[PDB]
């Protein structure tokens, strides 16, 4: 039978550790070729394989390739290549004879282009096949803020460049894009300065122990951060290589490892007829000397791929003519290579790794999530991109916290409250001044003429105003009461102007005498400034709505260590452009009060009324002074204005009556 020759280009020596890999993957392909001899898928021909040692030096590999070209027979395919330079160079040069090279360990995305490499295919999942997986894991546990850290190597910068290419369209933020070369410790410094919660590391093996030891020095661990790291190092690599393993182990737990999964968990019949369990058992009892490889699955699948490929392209219309065209290939033909490319590219079937497909020189693989649980890694979850499902292994994951941490700095706000045990004693003092007012009104009607009644009206309105001052502020059970602060401030101002008009018109008439129609003129002169203050009330209504405003005082503390910050807020009734209005109102009050304040110095030789108007004008100006020098704390200002209001509004009646009834009741 005429043989169909094919050539494998593998490192077979002992001077390189990848010779162990080639010697490990040789039993799977010889078992596969003996299975092909068992089934005998091809009556007239028989397959032949010629092995060639490379050691992946470029000159020696091209020399062995040239020797095989010059001296060997009419080869049909070429197979293999592990070292990236001699794969890159052969994949660029392959079109000079229009042939196809099949690899199984080239794990660099630079072979993704087909204008550069139209004849190249691979079955190993690349490093860009973890990027849908990490998005699905993040949406599985709702993470928002992340900081990246990429080592300045071409591969890490390439996957960093592809993070942006895969990240487009979702609610994701990338804050700290630090890219160091050999000092990761200042990078952890910068990361702690931007205090980002989740690390997505990209570096080599030797940098990792130094990064975690001087991240212990920054204390970048705890129940606050996660670390997503590519975990393809050798197991227990950290046992050999300024920082002790005692000061490393209590911070090297919880580090999420992102690998590719070798096998599956299906016990289903493949096209071989066996299960992955039977295949692995037969493999490990096939061999005994070699250290176990982890690529023999891809070697076994790809041999059956190309065998099914050559039988489906062998089926041509040309029974005779193609059989001569294969038997007389002088390396020049390209139409046969085009049909072989079409029949190989449309390969889709189920093997040991699963249902294999091909999306542009790539097979859709299985991504193995893992976690370093208790001094070792454990498999925790899978993800299949052909179906886009992310399996997880419940009852296996653990957390040093209790919830997968929240990522942004989350805040909460509330109003500034006042001391209720301070407010309650003032609410108890509310009633006594009012009852004394309504009792001395009955003493005045027992005397029964309008002057002390107007004084009592001002006192009652003041005792109502000082009650409803802070009753609307902190207790916000009446929510739309900031519109009514002006509707009670006009009540307060009317009581104020009534009391001070009864203080002022009497002393002005005492100055003018120092007739009953003159008392009528005095009453209408008080009514004139009453209506002047009513016009100022409607001018305050027209000048601003005085609506509900909120001052948001932002300091964001934490009383009990939780990251839910607190920010207080204060209700403000003003509209911040009535400063001219309140300034002219306070000047109006000062001009109305300084007349009597100056005149009390003169007429001292209405005997204690000037001493009353002085001893209330000082308290009123100290109330305005402490009013403008506060609202930093809305409790002390309100209690001090309640204190001065219950001072003045009953001290006027007390110093106007304390000798009156004492001399009338001797």
């Amino acid at each position: 039978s005429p043989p169909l020759s094919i050539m494998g280009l593998m490192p077979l020596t002992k001077e390189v550790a990848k010779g162990s890999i080639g010697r490990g993957v040789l039993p799977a392909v010889e078992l596969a070729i003996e299975q092909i001899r068992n089934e005998s898928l091809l009556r007239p021909y028989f397959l032949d394989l010629r092995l060639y040692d490379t050691e992946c030096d470029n000159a020696k590999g091209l020399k062995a390739f040239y020797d095989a070209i010059k001296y060997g027979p009419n080869h049909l395919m070429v197979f293999g290549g592990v070292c990236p330079s001699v794969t890159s160079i052969i994949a660029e040069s392959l079109q000079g004879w229009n042939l196809v090279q099949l690899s199984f360990a080239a794990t660099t995305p630079v072979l993704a282009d087909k204008k550069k490499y139209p004849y190249f295919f691979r079955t190993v999942p690349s490093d860009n096949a973890v990027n849908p997986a990490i998005l699905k894991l993040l949406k599985h546990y709702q993470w928002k803020r992340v900081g990246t850290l990429t080592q300045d190597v071409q591969r890490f910068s390439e996957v960093r460049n592809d993070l942006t290419g895969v990240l487009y369209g979702e609610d994701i933020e990338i804050s700290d894009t630090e890219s160091f070369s050999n000092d990761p410790c200042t990078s952890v410094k910068k990361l702690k300065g931007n205090d980002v919660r989740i690390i997505l590391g990209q570096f080599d093996q030797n940098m990792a122990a130094k990064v975690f030891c001087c991240a212990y020095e920054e204390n970048m661990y705890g129940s606050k951060y996660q670390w997503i790291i590519p975990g393809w190092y050798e197991p227990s690599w950290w046992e050999q290589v300024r920082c002790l393993r005692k000061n490393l182990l209590a911070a090297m737990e919880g580090y999420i490892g992102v690998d590719f999964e070798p096998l599956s968990s299906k016990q289903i019949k493949t096209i071989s007829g066996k299960t992955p369990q039977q295949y692995e058992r037969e493999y490990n009892n096939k061999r005994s000397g070699v250290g176990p490889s982890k690529f023999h699955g891809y070697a076994y699948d790809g041999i059956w791929v190309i065998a099914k490929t050559l039988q489906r392209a062998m089926e041509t219309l040309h029974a005779s003519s193609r059989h001569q065209r294969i038997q007389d290939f002088n390396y020049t033909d390209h139409t046969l290579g085009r049909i072989i490319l079409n029949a190989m590219n449309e390969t889709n079937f189920f093997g040991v790794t699963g249902q294999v497909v091909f999306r542009n020189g790539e097979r859709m693989g299985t991504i193995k999530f893992t976690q370093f649980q208790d001094s070792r890694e454990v498999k925790v979850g899978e993800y299949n991109a052909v179906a886009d499902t992310l399996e997880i292994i419940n009852d296996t994951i653990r957390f040093q916290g209790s919830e997968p941490p929240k990522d942004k700095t989350i805040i909460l706000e509330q109003l500034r409250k006042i001391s209720l045990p301070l407010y309650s004693i003032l609410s108890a003092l509310t009633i006594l001044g009012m009852i004394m007012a309504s009792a001395f009104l009955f003493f005045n009607i027992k005397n029964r003429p309008y002057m002390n009644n107007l004084i009592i009206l001002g006192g009652m309105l003041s005792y109502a105003s000082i009650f409803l001052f802070g009753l609307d502020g902190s207790f916000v059970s009446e929510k739309t009461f900031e519109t009514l602060c002006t509707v009670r401030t006009w009540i307060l101002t009317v009581g104020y102007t009534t009391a001070f008009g009864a203080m002022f018109a009497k002393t002005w008439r005492v100055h003018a005498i120092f007739k009953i129609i003159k008392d009528q003129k005095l009453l209408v002169i008080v009514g004139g400034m009453l209506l002047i203050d009513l016009c100022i009330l409607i001018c305050w209504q027209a000048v601003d709505p005085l609506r509900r405003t909120v001052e948001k005082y932002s300091m964001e503390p934490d009383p009990a260590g939780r990251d839910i910050s607190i920010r207080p807020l204060l209700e403000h009734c003003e509209n911040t452009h009535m400063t001219i209005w309140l300034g002219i109102v306070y000047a109006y009050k000062g001009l109305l009060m300084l007349f009597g304040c100056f005149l009390a110095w003169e007429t001292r030789n209405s005997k204690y009324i000037g001493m009353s108007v002085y001893n209330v004008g000082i308290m009123c100006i100290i109330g305005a002074a402490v009013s403008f020098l506060t609202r930093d704390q809305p409790n002390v200002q309100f209690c001090i204005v309640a204190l001065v209001i219950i001072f003045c509004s009953t001290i006027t009646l007390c110093l106007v009556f304390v000798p009156k009834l004492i001399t009338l009741r001797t």
């Binding site: 470029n58 000159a59 020696k60 091209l62 020399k63 040239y66 070209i69 010059k70 160079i89 660029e92 040069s93 079109q95 000079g96 300084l594 100056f598 003169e602």
Partner: protein, 657 residues
């Protein structure tokens, strides 16, 4: 004889079609060296050659085609750069020596990876000392760089960074692309840089210039640095891959600086060939039917020429060389030892190459000036000689730079409004002194009030302007002196005014009262001294306006003003205004209380409302151009004028009425 065969390679097209010119050059060179029997008494030179278009697939096919055939070749000649690296990497397995002629990779200077490799072409790092001197001439600091993603450009950009870092010039915007110019020219428009250096081949130079015309990023503040060994017609060849027309590109590429290096003797000398450079160039223009402005590789053909002549003299230095096989090494080491000590004088001057390379002395620099290139000057790096010719036109003459800023001082109105203020103060002084002399020459509290109002009319002038007299920057001293004098003057005048109405209110209801009111006046100088002890003076700077109000020049105008202040002066001046307002309202109440007295009360009623209406309008104002100083001076001089012209009306009018 003996036909000795030499393999060769000529890229006829692709990114650099130099082999179109070098092939007749080497044909001429082989016919000229096929003349002397003293160099080769026994052999005969033969040439085998192909094309590769700087394509490694064809290059690998042609290397196999020459290697695995007949007859045996000895020396190879690779054209492009990546293919030159590949053949110098793989020449060791046949024990061969390789000679390149166009590569510029400075990493190709290593002898470990490349023991059997030489190159006549000098590297790309001799654009950087000339680049940093042309940057040092104009002091520009914000430069942006853009490159195609290649090793032969990143080793240049790394040499330029590690050369510019000692000069203290930062490189801010460092971008890169591969074949998409849209997003990086979007980023350059969004980063609005001034001077831009680019490193890419021609077909994308046309694409990036279509993109920069489309983004409208050419123009006034944009300087483009490119290499200059392109042809002069390059923006004229029809390329249907882009829809841009020829003259908007021609207007866009106008006025940019290009750099290169020399390739041959600028003088006229004679080689061993007994010809010169100029006659050689004449012979190339004779035999080449195309134009030198349209062909490729025309400037570099003499390095190929002296490369053959050098190897020919090396072969004469070796002088039984007919049994060469790729396995042995003795012939190769003997020829290598003879070629190592190669040092002579050829058409390009002294030809030494078994050193660290870069043996050229002068470089060259041009500028597109109106549809044609034109020379700026010459240079040498060792002697640091920058030969000039002063032909650089610019946008109207000046070189556009990065960005500047102007600090503008906020001008006063030292004009007729100030001169009117000064003349009203002088008129008040003269009127006051004339009325006081008339009163003395015919009310001692009235004389003291006249002295105080004269001191106010003497302190009215020295409010200053925006730095206009002999000697400045003592503005706190002169303003604090004027303020102290005006304070004491107003204190004296108002105290001697108010003490009369105080005593008339006392008499309504000899030097005791006068001496106690004089000490009441001198209390204010104790307040002035307490203001002088803890924080007397300060000349602060306000930056009240926004930067860059200018319309055409990119120098941001920041207007800054100055007012005399202190450490904490606001509450102090508020307290002093409150104290003086207290005294003034006391006077205005006593004038209605104890109603000389009628005129004194009416003068008090005028001066009080004047001072109270102008305290706030000088307290809360800051635009001193026509409001603050104008209102204050109008207030003070109208006060003193009207108060004097009312208080001395009844004296002199009724003395002779």
């Amino acid at each position: 004889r003996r036909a000795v065969y030499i393999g060769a390679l000529f890229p006829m097209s692709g990114g650099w079609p130099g082999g179109q010119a070098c092939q007749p050059a080497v044909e001429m060179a082989l016919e000229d060296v096929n003349s002397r029997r003293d160099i080769l008494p026994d052999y005969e030179l033969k040439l085998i050659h192909h094309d590769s278009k700087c394509d490694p697939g064809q290059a690998t096919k042609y290397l196999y085609e020459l290697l695995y055939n007949d007859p045996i070749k000895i020396i190879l000649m690779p054209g492009c750069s990546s293919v030159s690296t590949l053949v110098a990497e793989a020449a060791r397995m046949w024990n061969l020596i390789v000679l390149s002629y166009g590569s510029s990779s400075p990493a190709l200077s290593n002898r470990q990876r490349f023991p059997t490799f030489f190159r006549t072409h000098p590297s790309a790092t001799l654009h950087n000392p000339t680049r940093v001197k042309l940057f040092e001439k104009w002091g520009w600091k914000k430069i942006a760089t853009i490159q195609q993603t290649t090793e032969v450009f990143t080793s240049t950009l790394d040499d330029l960074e590690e050369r510019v870092k000692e000069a203290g010039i930062e490189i801010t915007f460092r971008q890169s692309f591969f074949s998409d110019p849209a997003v990086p020219v979007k980023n350059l428009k969004r980063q609005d840089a001034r001077i831009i250096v680019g490193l890419f081949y021609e077909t994308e130079a046309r694409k990036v210039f279509c993109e920069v015309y489309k983004e409208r990023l050419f123009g006034k503040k944009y300087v483009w640095f490119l290499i200059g060994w392109y042809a002069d017609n390059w923006f004229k060849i029809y390329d249907p891959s882009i829809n841009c027309t020829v003259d908007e590109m021609t207007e866009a590429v106008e006025g940019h600086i290009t750099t290169e290096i020399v390739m041959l003797n600028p003088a006229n000398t004679r080689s061993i060939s007994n010809m010169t450079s100029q006659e050689f160039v004449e012979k190339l223009t004779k035999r080449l039917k195309r134009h030198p402005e349209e062909t490729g590789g025309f400037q570099e053909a003499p390095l190929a020429y002296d490369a053959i002549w050098a190897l020919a003299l090396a072969l004469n230095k070796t002088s039984r060389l007919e049994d060469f096989n790729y396995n042995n090494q003795t012939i190769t080491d003997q020829i290598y030892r003879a070629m190592n000590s190669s040092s002579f004088e050829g058409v390009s001057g002294h030809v030494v190459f078994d050193a660290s390379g870069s043996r050229m002395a002068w470089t060259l620099i041009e500028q597109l000036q109106g549809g044609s290139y034109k020379k700026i000057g010459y240079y040498d790096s060792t002697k640091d000689d920058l030969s000039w010719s002063k032909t650089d036109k610019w946008i109207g003459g000046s070189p556009p730079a990065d960005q500047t800023l102007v600090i503008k001082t906020f001008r006063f109105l030292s004009q007729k409004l100030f001169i009117s203020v000064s003349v009203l103060s002088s008129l008040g002084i003269v009127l006051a002194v004339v009325c006081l002399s008339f009163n003395i020459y015919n009310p001692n509290l009235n004389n003291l009030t006249a002295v105080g109002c004269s001191l106010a009319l003497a302190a009215v002038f020295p409010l200053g302007l925006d730095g206009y007299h002999i000697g400045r920057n003592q503005f706190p001293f002169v303003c604090q002196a004027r303020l102290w004098l005006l304070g004491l003057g107003f204190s004296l005048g108002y105290g001697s005014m108010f003490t009369k109405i105080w005593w008339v209110h006392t008499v309504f209801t000899p030097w005791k009262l006068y001496a106690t009111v004089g000490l009441l006046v001198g209390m204010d100088v104790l307040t002035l001294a307490i203001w002088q002890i803890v924080d007397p003076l300060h000349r602060t700077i306000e930056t009240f306006a926004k930067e860059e109000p200018k319309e055409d020049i990119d120098v941001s105008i920041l207007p800054q003003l100055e007012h005399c202040s202190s450490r904490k002066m606001n509450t102090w001046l508020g307290i002093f205004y409150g104290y003086k307002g207290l005294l003034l309202l006391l006077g205005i109440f006593l004038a209605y209380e104890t109603k000389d007295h009628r005129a004194v009360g009416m003068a008090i009623y005028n001066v009080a409302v004047l001072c109270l209406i102008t305290a706030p309008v000088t307290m809360i104002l800051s635009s001193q151009q026509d409001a603050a100083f104008a209102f204050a001076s109008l207030a003070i001089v109208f006060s003193s004028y009207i108060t004097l012209v009312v208080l001395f009306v009844p004296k002199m009018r009724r003395l002779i009425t």
